[PDB]
Amino acid sequence: AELDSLLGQEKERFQVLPGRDKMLYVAAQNERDTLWARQVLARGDYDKNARVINENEENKRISIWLDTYYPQLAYYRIHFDEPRKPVFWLSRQRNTMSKKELEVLSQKLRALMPYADSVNITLMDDVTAAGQAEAGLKQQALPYSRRNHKGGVTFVIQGALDDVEILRARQFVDSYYRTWGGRYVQFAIELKDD
């Protein structure tokens, strides 16, 4: 019962990974495919440890552990893209960890990810994160008020909104979140009467 044949006809929707922990992993790109694969494991059978991977769920799982063991660590989001070598965005300006400490950190992350062979920790500039957030926001001709504070920035959008600008606002926000994540830049859409 080869797992590849157990999964749907369009086998290219899933990336099967062979974890060093003897668990065969199923990387899915969407929660509909996540559920699909989970139903396969519960419905059919495969005599071997197995577990479905979901980019957001894994990002969260890691962030939980990470907060406990490395509290106050300033970071953005893990980009899984190529399962084998996920990229860890780390705040360049807020973290003062030494190279050796960063080595250790990546090793702990490798422990958290049975499939990943290595972790590419890289430092990102907080300014460029904020710059992109605001630039795109004003490109869309949206009204807003920026809130700089220690440790982050919030973009407040208030007042009555036109259905067109509402659509535009959400599209922008979702994309920003998908890329950078919501740990530094926080958006605040508030539909109110004037």
Binding site: E31, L35, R38, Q39, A42, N56, A160, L161, D163, I166, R170, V173, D174, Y177, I189, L191, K192, D193
Partner: protein, 184 residues
């Protein structure tokens, strides 16, 4: 092999079973024709099964809608009754609409009523709306709430963003695994 419930309709039977499975209890649905459905459980689980029937107020009651108490079969009618009938239909129709929005699994809608404004020589009051919604797990609820609110705002003669309340969440971890039989 214990009898738990009898004479259930189709909806009730499936709902009760869902709960029992969620709490790790296998259940049998027996079709007795005109006599309805019966639910039976393994004796080892029976005690727990009873506990949960109590806990969740099972079997479920039929859904209550306002129009059910002001039927068109009446020989006569009144402004009061007719206005109530209309509002009942409107709530239902709004629920039908919200459940077609992307990511919405379930939604409920309430609208305030006016039973005696004009009756007392008074002008009508502002309309209040409230709604509940369940989304597909992982969905960005904090932003989606604004579509609901905007939609409802222009869906009725005179409402505003301070008199529309939306409370929502998302589904739980799907029960995709069978409870299993007792050991014996």
């Amino acid at each position: 092999d214990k009898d738990l419930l009898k004479g259930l309709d189709q909806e009730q039977a499936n709902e009760v079973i869902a709960v029992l499975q969620m709490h790790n209890i296998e259940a049998n649905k027996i079709d007795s024709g005109k006599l309805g459905y019966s639910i039976t459980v393994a004796e080892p689980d029976f005690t727990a099964a009873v506990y949960w029937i109590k806990t969740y107020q099972l079997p479920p009651r039929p859904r209550v809608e306002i129009a059910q108490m002001f039927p068109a079969d009446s020989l006569v009618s009144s402004p009061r009754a007719e206005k109530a009938r209309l509002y009942s239909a409107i709530e239902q129709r709004l629920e039908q609409s919200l459940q077609t929005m992307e990511g919405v699994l379930s939604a409920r809608v309430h609208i305030s009523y006016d039973i005696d404004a004009g009756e007392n020589g008074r002008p009508p009051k502002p309309v209040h709306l409230s709604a509940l919604a369940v989304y597909e797990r992982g969905s960005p609820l904090a932003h989606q709430i604004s579509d609901i609110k905007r939609f409802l705002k222009n869906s009725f003669a005179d409402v505003d963003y301070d008199n529309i309340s939306v409370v929502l969440s998302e589904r739980s971890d799907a029960q995709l695994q069978a409870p299993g039989t007792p050991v014996k």
